Amino acid sequence: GMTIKKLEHELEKQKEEDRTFAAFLLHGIKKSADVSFDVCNHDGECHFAGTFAILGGEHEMPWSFDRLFR
Amino acid sequence: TTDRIWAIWQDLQRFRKRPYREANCAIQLMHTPLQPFDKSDNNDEATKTHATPHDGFEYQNSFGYAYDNLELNHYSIPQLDHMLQERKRHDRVFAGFLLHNIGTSADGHVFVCLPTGEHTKDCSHEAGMFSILGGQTEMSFVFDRLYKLDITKALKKNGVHLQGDFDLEIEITAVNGSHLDSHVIHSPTILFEAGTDSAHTDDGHTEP
Amino acid sequence: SMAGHGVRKEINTLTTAEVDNLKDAMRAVMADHGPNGYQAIAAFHGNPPMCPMPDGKNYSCCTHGMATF
Numbered sequence: 001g002m003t004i005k006k007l008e009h010e011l012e013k014q015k016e017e018d019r020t021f022a023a024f025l026l027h028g029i030k031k032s033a034d035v036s037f038d039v040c041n042h043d044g045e046c047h048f049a050g051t052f053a054i055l056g057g058e059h060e061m062p063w064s065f066d067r068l069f070r
Numbered sequence: 071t072t073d074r075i076w077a078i079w080q081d082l083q084r085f086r087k088r089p090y091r092e093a094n095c096a097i098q099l100m101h102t103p104l105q106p107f108d109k110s111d112n113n114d115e116a117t118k119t120h121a122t123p124h125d126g127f128e129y130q131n132s133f134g135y136a137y138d139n140l141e142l143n144h145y146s147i148p149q150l151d152h153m154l155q156e157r158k159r160h161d162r163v164f165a166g167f168l169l170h171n172i173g174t175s176a177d178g179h180v181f182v183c184l185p186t187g188e189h190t191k192d193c194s195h196e197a198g199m200f201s202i203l204g205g206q207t208e209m210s211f212v213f214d215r216l217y218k219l220d221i222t223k224a225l226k227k228n229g230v231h232l233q234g235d236f237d238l239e240i241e242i243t244a245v246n247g248s249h250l251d252s253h254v255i256h257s258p259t260i261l262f263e264a265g266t267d268s269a270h271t272d273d274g275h276t277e278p
Numbered sequence: 279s280m281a282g283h284g285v286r287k288e289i290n291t292l293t294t295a296e297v298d299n300l301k302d303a304m305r306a307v308m309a310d311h312g313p314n315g316y317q318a319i320a321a322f323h324g325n326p327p328m329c330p331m332p333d334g335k336n337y338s339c340c341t342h343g344m345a346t347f
């Protein structure tokens with residue numbers, strides 16, 4: 001629903017709190033794939049960390065991100 | 071150039087199929103002779119004949135001067151017409167100024183301040199500005215109607231709707247840089263203009 | 279003149295006339311064999327591969343994994 005002005009305010013609020021991120025370095029993995037990863041404590045207890053997807057296929061041009069995906 | 075634009079409007083008018091050389095407004099004024107053109111000080115005979123502003127409309131053959139091209143911003147007259155329509159497409163909100171221009175020329179700046187900060191932008195301070203040319207010598211004049219300026223872009227940017235409560239702040243400065251008392255000047259009004267398609271109401275029921 | 283800007287709006291706010299025009303226009307687009315046809319445009323994305331590399335190798339044109347994306 002947010003207006004541009006409103007959205008900016010909303011975003012800043014997020015900034016206020018500390019956050020922890022996982023970073024991924026992605027390169028062409030010759031195909032489309034879905035990745036799921038979980039965070040696990042030493043106990044071995046785990047929770048679903050998150051998901052991201054890679055769109056690709058054969059004859060794709062090669063590519064690698066300059067930076068990490070957060 | 072200004073005269074050329076007037077001519078441009080004139081030709082556009084015919085495109086609209088409105089009469090080109092016809093003004094059905096300020097009839098009284100039109101007939102009035104326009105001094106000093108009326109007087110002998112003016113050697114130019116053509117102008118003297120031309121003194122009534124009514125005759126003024128047809129520059130062609132009256133004046134006998136033409137423009138190489140009548141276009142605005144390299145837009146054909148039919149192009150302008152199409153362009154105009156597009157502008158019409160969106161709803162618009164305007165601020166109207168009652169100009170009782172008096173005194174020396176001055177510049178006026180205004181923007182609509184919003185009651186809250188927070189997430190919402192502070193006073194943009196740039197609704198737009200218009201200037202008025204004047205001198206002590208000038209005869210008093212007041213506009214019959216309001217001068218409309220299109221606020222819409224700025225308002226949308228700030229994210230306010232027409233409905234949103236906002237105030238308009240105006241500052242008038244002389245060329246001199248002396249501040250002019252804004253109190254005397256009447257506050258501007260806010261007009262909302264829409265096309266034929268208007269909105270239906272939430273509360274109440276229009277159709278029987 | 280049919281010009282000005284196009285308006286891209288939300289899908290959920292589908293206006294029947296608008297939808298009809300889109301469907302019909304799309305139908306025609308699909309039909310045309312011309313280079314500004316549905317098949318031709320689709321080809322840009324990937325198969326059949328439209329891009330040459332200087333070796334002569336063919337690859338999908340869409341830029342992914344890049345800033346240009």
Ligand code: CUO
Nearest residue numbers: 055323340341342
């Ligand atoms: O597919 Cu190439 O990007 Cu959405």
